[PDB]
């Protein structure tokens, strides 16, 4: 019987198997039939079906923008995730045990629902870790010390903001403010300023080429395709650095106004420990151009990207299964 730990993220689900660590990497996405809601297919399974099917049948995020996902949808991804990571040619494999990543501050009715889905979809036994301590053990940080450590991770919907010190998070705060917005803030500022629609897949490429967080100055420009909203007809333009970063300024001052915060509402000395040690960052959304070096001026306080943010969460939910009781 193997030990899985699981983020079934907003954008990216990671399951993590004790022993070899990171083995699935897919999509957090559904093919859903569009009039009777059925979820056909789901990860890598639900791409193979766009396209290929008969079906009105749709592929969607049930998590995009950082919306709960209803019980059912829950228990049909992790039934997909669970069965996928564990796949084995064996036999005597008994149901495995599952550390489920959560966002801090789950109600007992909401974790319920959570352990329920999970054993309902194969698990013996589940469990849950909130996100940002996952966040903390794969970023390194010594959540167990009685130091103050901060950790920042910014996913697609999600940012969760959280001081840590003795095996417990100290404050903490948690916004729906991260990838998903910001690429919606590129989508809106050129609808606005040229009246032309670009899809998600382009308005992520210019984040990722030229999006930055504070100053744009030598970044660099682009060439986007999208469409004219009054002829209907393709057409390309050209944007700036400048412009991407002016879009994104209410986003990023979102994000910096939440570790602020966090930081005034924690203990003194977890802040001095944490001017120190530093402000490290997880998941893709810290991959934001020049965010780092936002937040530190913000703060005054140093602000280090944890190599592989987009594997933090997932590594620190895998070496919880090492210390399960800790999470009952
Ligand atoms: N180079 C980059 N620059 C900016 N954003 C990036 C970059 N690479 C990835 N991202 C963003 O990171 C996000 C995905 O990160 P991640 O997988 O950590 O999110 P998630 O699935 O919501 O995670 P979780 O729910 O476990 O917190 C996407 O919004 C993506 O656009």
Not at 141 to 145: D, Q, T
Not at 284 to 290: E, S, T
């Given at each position: 019987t193997k030990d899985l730990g699981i983020d079934?993220?907003?954008?990216n689900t990671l399951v993590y198997v004790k022993?070899?660590?990171?083995?699935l990497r897919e999509p957090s996405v559904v093919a859903i039939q569009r009039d009777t809601k059925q979820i056909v297919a789901v990860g890598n399974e639900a791409k193979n079906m766009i396209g290929r099917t008969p079906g009105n049948i749709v592929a969607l995020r049930p998590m995009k923008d950082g919306v709960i996902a209803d019980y059912e949808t829950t228990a049909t991804m992790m039934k997909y995730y669970i069965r996928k990571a564990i796949k084995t040619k064996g036999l005597f494999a008994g149901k495995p045990y599952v550390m489920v990543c959560v966002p801090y501050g789950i109600t007992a009715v909401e974790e319920r629902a959570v352990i329920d889905a999970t054993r309902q979809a194969g698990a013996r036994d589940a469990y849950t870790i909130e996100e940002p301590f996952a966040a903390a053990i794969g970023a390194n940080?010594?959540?167990?010390?009685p130091t103050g450590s901060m950790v920042v991770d910014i996913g697609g919907g999600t940012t969760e903001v959280a001081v840590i010190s003795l095996g417990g998070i100290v404050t903490s705060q948690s916004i729906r403010i991260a990838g998903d917005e910001m690429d919606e803030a590129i989508i809106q500022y050129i609808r606005k300023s040229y009246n032309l629609m670009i899809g998600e897949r382009t308005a992520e490429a210019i984040k990722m080429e030229?999006?930055?967080?504070?100053?744009?100055?030598?970044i660099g420009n682009m060439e986007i395709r999208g469409r004219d909203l009054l002829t209907g007809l393709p057409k390309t333009i050209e944007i700036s650095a400048e412009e991407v970063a002016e879009a994104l300024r209410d986003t990023v001052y979102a994000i910096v106004e939440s570790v602020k915060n966090t930081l005034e509402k924690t203990p003194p000395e977890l802040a001095a420990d944490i001017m120190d040690r530093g402000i490290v960052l997880t998941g893709?959304?810290?991959?934001?151009?020049?965010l780092d070096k936002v937040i530190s001026q913000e703060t005054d306080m140093p602000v280090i990207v944890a190599e592989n943010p987009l594997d933090c969460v997932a590594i620190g939910t895998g070496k919880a299964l090492d210390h399960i009781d800790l999470f009952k």
């Open positions: 079934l993220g907003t954008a022993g070899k660590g990171i083995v940080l010594p959540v167990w010390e030229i999006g930055s967080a504070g100053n744009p100055e030598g893709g959304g810290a991959l934001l151009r020049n």
